[model samples]
Target: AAQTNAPWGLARISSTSPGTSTYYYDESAGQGSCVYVIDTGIEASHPEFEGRAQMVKTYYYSSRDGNGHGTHCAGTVGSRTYGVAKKTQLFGVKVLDDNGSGQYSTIIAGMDFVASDKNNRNCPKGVVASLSLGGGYSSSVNSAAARLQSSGVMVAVAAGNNNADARNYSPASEPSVCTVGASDRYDRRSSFSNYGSVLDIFGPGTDILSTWIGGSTRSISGTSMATPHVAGLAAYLMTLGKTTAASACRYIADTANKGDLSNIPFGTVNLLAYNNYQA
Candidate 1:
């Protein structure tokens, strides 16, 4: 099955695809406007998407969506089939090629576009940027990610799939960014998931089903899948009236299931409790 054991009703966190389709059977959270997805392109007409998946702006840093990886990542963030933000507008910035590879500079360029935040015609006020893939974090990247957060744009990133010693990557390891780690049905970190205090939250990332380029479905695994879950939550919390990045992060972290502290090598994440009170 696409969904494993279902933790903390993570399925209920947002109406995005995969999670929405897998959990709620509907796209609900990201309905009113748009969200900028900094990745490959989207499939657009998939069954779960149809009337959904609106593209605001597209930047081809590599090639076209000839490969299906970008589509798959996009589906997880905003695919109609099981998108988290069905109604949310999708802005595609193609940083990777058909083979799913690109230079760090290309990814940074996409970041620059969103971070500029000057009459961002494609993005909404208080827009959030979702990045599904990238190399390790660096001082420069971390600084930029922080700047985005400071500029009122929340940035969500994958924690990397290397299973390295937590301190390895850049963006995910950066304190300013919301680093997402992968978890299986058992609430245990995926064998390939990197773990550390840098990890902000754990989400289902194993065997996720999402849209591919040719109107098909593909199952892939990585911290990449987990990043969007947090991104969706960040957007949802924004809609619920949490306007700032710190506030949004506090809200989600507080609501996250925190009892798994002992098992994880990274210790307890201490997710914020869903008490309905703003942190």
Candidate 2:
């Protein structure tokens, strides 16, 4: 079974707010922000999400609940009160079904819907898309996401949980996407997190507690969990007038909590350092 609470294993209660804290606070404040969650649709009535979530747009590309992966991911990224960015809006695009499996075509279609939402008003203003699904780097997908980026859509992709080189994955390896790695409570790089020069940053990915299917909560682990932390952070960063995805990514990387692994390959990336550099 997927380990619940994985992110907690990597999280340390910083004396000062972590960069993620900055990201979460900004989102909760509701500064010009919206996020498109490309996953399983949310439960619609999750208490933690009360009045915070809006199904600005939805696509049922995979029938429904093909497995339970999408729902689990959905809860982590935008689950009401307990989520990282509690006040951020969510546009659910159900690309994966209950089986926890989805085709690239389905994922692409969902992206298309998000990109076209303005013409269709399918979602809100200033939309950033979040995807916790990626097997490897795909030029096609990278190109698609880049199109969104070009159109002012920010994307956050999960570096696989393989504990190997990140080059193994497609979208995560792609230069256009913001690749997220995993860290433990002690601020250790997750053994399962893919690392490489291409890997951008790390976030709490161990022992995370969040909402689940059927209005429940559970703990889960993986770079999947870590990806949303960055996604939520990116939304918050955007509120600070970060119209470009690269600037938001640089902010997160520059402001990361520095620990033992700062010098190693695939080790901890420091947000504090980045923030100071910006200053």
Candidate 3:
């Protein structure tokens, strides 16, 4: 059985059973690494973050998470109790508006901001970026992600929740980005997760509980929720001195638990695992 207060997604990646293997990597916890959540902003005041989250850039609501989606994703990335990389610096780059919608140009700008090390944002060591929203294909967005990757930043994008081939999407189809699909607690592909050759990996996203707007919490489901899990893992790896984007991506793909997706179509297309779980 899963731990009572712990998120199953976190446990899955940490390889911690209910009362065993609960000890996390206290040495790092992603310290010295930075992760940017480009979404509907974030509730910077949310208690789950304990004041660790900040809004580094905002194209929408002045860095406020009115829609709750971005806050939830950020929580999963670095919240003290709910996050994967517990001590990592969390930045919110608001690309989506209150309606959870944004233009491709805005998203491109956000990506550019993340990749830039200007103003000494400490991103000179590269960064991990999480994108939890998507729409129709956009060449500009894909190009931006590719550019970021070449510059040492790893971008993790949702594989879409449309239950279609991920190859039909924009950033997900872009080889430069680490395209992430959704999996359930049972280690199976989520019914709504997009799949196919483009998907790079899978993360637990179904019925995920995390931080929300107004210092609250909520349970939601989507590939959006899964993207941050990968982002957090990438950030954690960075703290371990992984550095380059390609190196982190390769490490994750090489260390994932295999043969856990037999029940889903195209299960063999991408590796489905989190952290370095061996069982």
Highest TM-score: which candidate?
3
> Where is the poorest 10-residue window by lDDT in model 3?
16-25
Candidate 3 lDDT tens digits, 38-66? 99988888777877788988886477878
lDDT of 1 by residue, 118-198 (tens): 245544434777777767657776676777777767788788888864556866777776878786544556788877778
- Once fitted onto the true fold, the runs of candidate 1 whose alpha carbons sit more than 4 angstroms away are 1-28, 51-63, 122-125, 261-263, 266-279
Question: How high is the lDDT of residue 202 in model 3?
Answer: 85
What tens digits encode model 2's per-residue C-alpha lDDT throughout 1-279? 122233342123221333232221332322456677777665556676675554544445333444445555655555544454445676667776755556787777777777777455432325567788876666777677777666767778787888777776766877766788876655567778778777777766777666776667777788887777677667655655544554666666656655534424634343321222112
Candidate 3 error regions (>4 Å): 1-4, 16-27, 117-119, 123-126, 267-270, 277-279
State the TM-score for model 1.
0.81
- Cα RMSD of all models vs. native, in order, equals 4.9, 5.4, 2.9
TM-score of 3: 0.91
Please give the CA lDDT of all the candidate structures: 0.62, 0.60, 0.79
Give the clashing pairs for model 3.
none
TM-score of each: 0.81, 0.79, 0.91
- List where candidate 2 sits over 4 angstroms from the true fold: 1-28, 54-68, 118-125, 242-246, 259-279
Q: State the lDDT at 227 in candidate 2.
A: 78
